[PDB]
Amino acid sequence: APEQEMVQVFIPAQAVGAIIGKKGQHIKQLSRFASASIKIAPPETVRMVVITGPPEAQFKAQGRIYGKLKEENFFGPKEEVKLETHIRVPASAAGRVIGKGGKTVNELQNLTAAEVVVPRDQTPDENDQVIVKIIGHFYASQMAQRKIRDILAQVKQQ
């Protein structure tokens, strides 16, 4: 059964208008395209897009956010869109995302050219989960997320 995941994508504050669209048109139809729930989180004081859905939904929705930002010239003419994404992993599995000595997060970064960072002083949330930070282009971020998901599923069996 397609399990659901929640991802937080940070976008430039000024881009919220193009993601939402007039009368919310763009964010509704993006939800239908991806078959995902897609929400702009309230400002704490970048803005955070919260995407909830299974992996294929995540791919479609995230793909369209990177694409919309590209199309609106939010970055630059020669500039690939690079965004920060936060995902949550079991605390008991974070040490396996890092690897012994740090070898798996290193391999991740070398394979994808995404920057992947597990902050080390975290308090697990009420679901015993901690943040992994992913910064990169669309493909790099997708590949980091897919790999981390596969690591988690491995730890779960064993």
Residue 121's beta-bridge partner residues?
Answer: none
Contact predicate 53/37, CB 8 Å: yes
Q: Which candidate, 82, 79, 87, places its Cα nearest to that of 129? A: 87
Query: Please, are residues 91 and 129 in contact by the beta-carbon 8 Å criterion?
Result: yes
Indicate the angle between helix axes 138-157 and 103-112, nearest 10 degrees. Answer: 150
Q: Give the determination technique.
A: X-ray
Q: Under a CB-based contact definition with an 8 Å cutoff, are residues 143 and 134 in contact? A: no
Resolution limit in angstroms?
Answer: 1.9
Quickly tell me which residue has 């994404």 as its tokens: 85
Q: Is 41 exposed, middle or buried (0-12, 13-18, 19+ CB in 10 A)?
A: exposed
Place of tokens 């997060």: 105
3-class DSSP state of 17: helix
